[PDB]
Design a protein around this ligand. Structure first.
Ligand SMILES: [Ca+2]
Ligand code: NI
Length: 153
């Protein structure tokens, strides 16, 4: 109809296989005519942790205000190919609405508490090739209604 009209594009800002950080960059576009409430929107980035440690997500930039964008880490259960964990990005109510036919970027990083390495190469959501925003079905997005973009592992 016209309520989950959220286009999701993605790329990795850093593509080193052995990397102490992962650098997800999303661009979300409201392709409908009705405004989208960002507070109900979640994003997932799926990966293998390569040595589990407490992790932190920082949103460095988003037009909606980086402090309104936060991340938590959840274990996949059961684990599967390319995915034993996911980052889940959420928006606060202060993030506001995304207008019809407008887009916002969500640029962030995450790392382990001890700054030890990931191997990005085997990560479900990792795009080793893209150097700018691409239509990527290996990250997912959600509204209040559930999945609205992508293929869960
Ligand atoms: Ca990995
Ligand atoms: Ni709809």
């Amino acid at each position: 109809g016209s309520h989950m009209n959220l286009k999701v594009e993605f790329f990795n800002a850093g593509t080193q296989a052995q990397s102490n950080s992962i650098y997800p960059k999303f661009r979300l576009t409201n392709t409908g005519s009705n405004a989208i409430n960002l507070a109900d929107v979640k994003l997932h980035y799926y990966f293998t942790v390569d040595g589990d440690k407490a992790q932190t997500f920082w949103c460095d930039w988003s037009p909606v205000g980086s402090s309104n964008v936060t991340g938590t880490f959840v274990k996949m259960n059961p684990t599967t190919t390319g995915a034993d964990q996911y980052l889940e990005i959420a928006f606060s109510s202060a993030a506001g609405t995304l207008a019809a036919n407008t887009s916002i970027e969500v640029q962030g990083r995450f790392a382990k508490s001890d700054w030890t390495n990931y191997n990005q190469a085997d990560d479900y959501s990792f795009n080793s090739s893209a150097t700018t925003y691409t239509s990527w079905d290996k990250v997912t997005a959600y509204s209040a209604e559930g999945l609205i973009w992508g293929i869960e592992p």
